[PDB]
Amino acid sequence: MSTPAVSHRFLVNFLFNNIPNPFDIAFQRISGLSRTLEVSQHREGGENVRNLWLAEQVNHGSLVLERGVMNASPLTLQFDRVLRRESTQWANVVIMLLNELSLPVTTWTLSHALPVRWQMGDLDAGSNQVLINTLELRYQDMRMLGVKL
Amino acid sequence: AITADDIAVQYPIPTYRFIVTLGDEQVPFTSASGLDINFDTIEYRDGTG
């Protein structure tokens, strides 16, 4: 059987409408994409032994990203504009894992992602650590691709 | 020429000759160890160094 996919190589591509060039930014800690369907349980009168689950509404999670405090990229300059309320532009994000050669084995492809939260790491006098800042986006739809679905 | 009254002032002291007074009496012991003076340590660092 083919070997499963490990989780320490990944590219992320962003495409805003403010910014003319699509840019690719390296992260440390992409959190993880959930997708819940939100059923509800109904209880019938004469039926006491089975359950009844009724499908309603697909809920998508959130894209939480982590990287170090490095030079100003086109994405930390873009969260600065949205969190100062100077723009409300959102982007189409493409996230993909890479195998041993270079090849994309799975792709996640988020749509209309909106920057909603910046979170700075701690400043501590005895710490021995890189200052990590936490970024967080809310998207509208999600569409996973690739050969390793 | 060292004249052993100078040994009693200058030379070090060996460990094998000792007496242990324990309360109101002396008890002859063979070994004795652990008479240390040990301190803890408190530190503080701020962002300026």
UniProtKB/TrEMBL annotation, chain A:
<dbReference type="InterPro" id="IPR011747">
    <property type="entry name" value="CHP02241"/>
</dbReference>
<keyword id="KW-0614">Plasmid</keyword>
<dbReference type="Pfam" id="PF06841">
    <property type="entry name" value="Phage_T4_gp19"/>
</dbReference>
<protein>
    <submittedName>
        <fullName>Afp5</fullName>
    </submittedName>
</protein>
<dbReference type="GO" id="GO:0005198">
    <property type="term" value="F:structural molecule activity"/>
</dbReference>
<dbReference type="InterPro" id="IPR010667">
    <property type="entry name" value="Phage_T4_Gp19"/>
</dbReference>
Automatic annotation (TrEMBL), chain B:
<protein>
    <submittedName>
        <fullName>Afp1</fullName>
    </submittedName>
</protein>
